[PDB]
Design a protein around this ligand. Structure first.
Ligand SMILES: OC[C@H]1O[C@@H](O)[C@H](O)[C@@H](O)[C@@H]1O
Ligand SMILES: OC[C@H]1O[C@@H](O)[C@H](O)[C@@H](O)[C@@H]1O
Lengths: 124, 42, 42, 124
């Protein structure tokens, strides 16, 4: 039993990138053929988890997995999303106590790197 | 208030102002991460 | 901006700002009335 | 086949009253044993109708009816609501082309009058 995630996009990328770059930890640089996995823990006070991400000149592989507190669940399949055109967002309920894995997958890239702008949220 | 109402909310109307609006009400909370709790592979 | 999305929106989060917010986006439109189109009885 | 109306409240009365009194046509004074019927035509472009109202020192009777373009329907039954404590709101879909009747019913009042702060809206 796992809730299907909600996923959407919004056209304003330039505004998103600007508000994000004010903080350095919110900007990831993914190297050639590299996969960055961001680990976001579940908050007991929390229920819903929200995410947003964007890239500068290029697209990037993106997926989401869920880890139990070794067992795993596929939330968002890892796919190449064009986040340089639009800001990509999404939401998911908490099916337990565990840890979320945000996969930024550059594995397919031989040469170019990727500047990522990502932000996380949660609820009560 | 209702988390599923916050989720259906942000889906429809999303903008930086709405994100900042919700940020203030305490409905949503921006989580900071760091060098750790983050991992790399080839 | 779906009309049914505006209805469940306001119900949850209602405020003067949100009303003013939706007022600007063209989602909701304030309607003015007058002496006529109004009637009194005893 | 008629959609049930949505009805709710928000605690901020003073802020509501302030924004409304900036316009005189938005402030109604209901006399003793009087009933004011506001006629809001259905906008063909429109789908949903929103309404808000409040009173100063006292409650007032409030209900909603729908007129066809003689035939009629009850949307919100006419009842005494305490709108002096909280701002009363609501919404309804358009089940046709016709005219909405907003009933402010002071009929039960022998002496006191009622200062009413009310506002409407519509959608596309
Ligand atoms: O690992 C999580 C994913 O891969 C496999 O373990 C399961 O068969 C899938 O249903 C699941 O979505
Ligand atoms: O995915 C974003 C970019 O990454 C590079 O490695 C690829 O060669 C490009 O074709 C691609 O547009």
């Amino acid at each position: 039993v796992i809730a299907a995630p909600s996923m959407w996009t919004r056209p304003q990328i330039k505004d998103f990138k600007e508000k994000i770059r004010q903080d350095a930890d919110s900007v990831i640089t993914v190297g050639r053929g590299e996969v960055v996995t961001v680990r976001v823990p579940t908050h007991e006070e929390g229920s819903y988890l929200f995410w947003e991400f964007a890239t500068d000149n290029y697209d990037i592989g993106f997926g989401v997995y869920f880890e139990w507190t070794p067992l795993l669940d596929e939330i968002v399949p890892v796919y190449r999303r064009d986040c340089h055109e639009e800001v990509y967002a999404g939401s998911h309920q908490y099916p337990g106590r565990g840890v979320y894995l945000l996969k930024f997958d550059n594995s397919y890239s031989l040469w170019r790197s990727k500047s990522v702008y990502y932000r996380v949220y949660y609820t009560r | 208030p209702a988390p599923p109402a916050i989720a259906d909310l942000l889906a429809s109307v999303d903008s930086e102002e709405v994100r900042d609006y919700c940020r203030t009400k305490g409905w949503i909370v921006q989580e900071k991460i760091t060098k750790e709790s983050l991992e790399r592979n080839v």
